[PDB]
Amino acid sequence: MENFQKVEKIGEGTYGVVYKARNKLTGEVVALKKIRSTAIREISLLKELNHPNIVKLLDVIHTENKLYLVFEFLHQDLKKFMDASALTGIPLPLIKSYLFQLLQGLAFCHSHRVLHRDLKPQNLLINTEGAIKLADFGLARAFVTLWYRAPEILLGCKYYSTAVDIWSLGCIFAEMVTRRALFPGDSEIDQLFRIFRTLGTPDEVVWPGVTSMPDYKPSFPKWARQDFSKVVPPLDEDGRSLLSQMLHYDPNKRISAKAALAHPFFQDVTKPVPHLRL
Numbered sequence: 001m002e003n004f005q006k007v008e009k010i011g012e013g014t015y016g017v018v019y020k021a022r023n024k025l026t027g028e029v030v031a032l033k034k035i036r037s038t039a040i041r042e043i044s045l046l047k048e049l050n051h052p053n054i055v056k057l058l059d060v061i062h063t064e065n066k067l068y069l070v071f072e073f074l075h076q077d078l079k080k081f082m083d084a085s086a087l088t089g090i091p092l093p094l095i096k097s098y099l100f101q102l103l104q105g106l107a108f109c110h111s112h113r114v115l116h117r118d119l120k121p122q123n124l125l126i127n128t129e130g131a132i133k134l135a136d137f138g139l140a141r142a143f144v145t146l147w148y149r150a151p152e153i154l155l156g157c158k159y160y161s162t163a164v165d166i167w168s169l170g171c172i173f174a175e176m177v178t179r180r181a182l183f184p185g186d187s188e189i190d191q192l193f194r195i196f197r198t199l200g201t202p203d204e205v206v207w208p209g210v211t212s213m214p215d216y217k218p219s220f221p222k223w224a225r226q227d228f229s230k231v232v233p234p235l236d237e238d239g240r241s242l243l244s245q246m247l248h249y250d251p252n253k254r255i256s257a258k259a260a261l262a263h264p265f266f267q268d269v270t271k272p273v274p275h276l277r278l
């Protein structure tokens with residue numbers, strides 16, 4: 001760890017503690033993640049997966065049989081920006097710019113067959129320039145909150161797809177708009193049933209094969225779907241339309257990131273600058 005001076009703790013990651021640190025040789029300030037052969041080779045692929053909307057993996061230090069991941073440092077995450085913007089809410093043009101950029105990031109990773117698997121506001125990092133970036137991408141395959149988990153994961157599907165990231169991002173889109181988490185479950189069954197209460201209990205009509213999933217139960221209660229107009233007011237019809245497609249039950253029907261980028265919601269997309277106090 002010789003060339004890094006720890007400045008402060010900035011996160012208790014899923015995979016260990018994250019520090020702000022300075023590279024004693026480059027002068028660069030970085031986020032240093034202390035992780036705690038296949039994982040080695042996986043991580044190595046991620047070092048090549050470079051995109052403006054993906055937090056850059058600067059370096060991977062395997063030493064003393066230990067693993068440190070050196071990332072690009074950003075000063076703020078979406079959860080904290082949302083908490084700070086709660087009285088007024090994030091302006092819609094910024095919501096739309098953030099959603100657009102995240103879909104670009106996703107489209108990139110997905111075309112390389114890399115999934116995130118654990119998108120959440122805490123791992124979406126923002127800068128003063130109006131950029132937003134996906135952090136911790138691909139780490140889950142290389143090696144707490146249920147709120148953003150796709151229903152096929154909850155129902156015990158082991159071979160899930162890139163569609164899981166689209167589901168998570170839909171949940172985040174909803175939360176930016178309403179300033180409340182869409183599905184704040186506190187256990188797997190509470191999470192599932194929150195989803196069902198809003199989108200309707202799924203069946204063979206809307207999701208062929210659902211009743212054959214590993215944790216599906218014929219005893220699940222049967223709730224009717226709510227209208228989105230009740231779910232994410234005052235989002236306009238383009239936004240609600242896009243959100244509905246990101247939240248399709250069947251992962252095969254769920255919109256892809258590339259198709260989402262062509263959606264009419266993005267016709268008037270721009271790139272505003274947020275007001276960040278650092």
Ligand SMILES: NS(=O)(=O)c1cccc2c(O)cccc12
Nearest residue numbers: 011018031071072073074123135
């Ligand atoms: N996702 S996180 O909470 O570990 C985190 C927090 C602040 C900055 C980070 C960063 O620059 C790169 C990755 C994760 C960060």
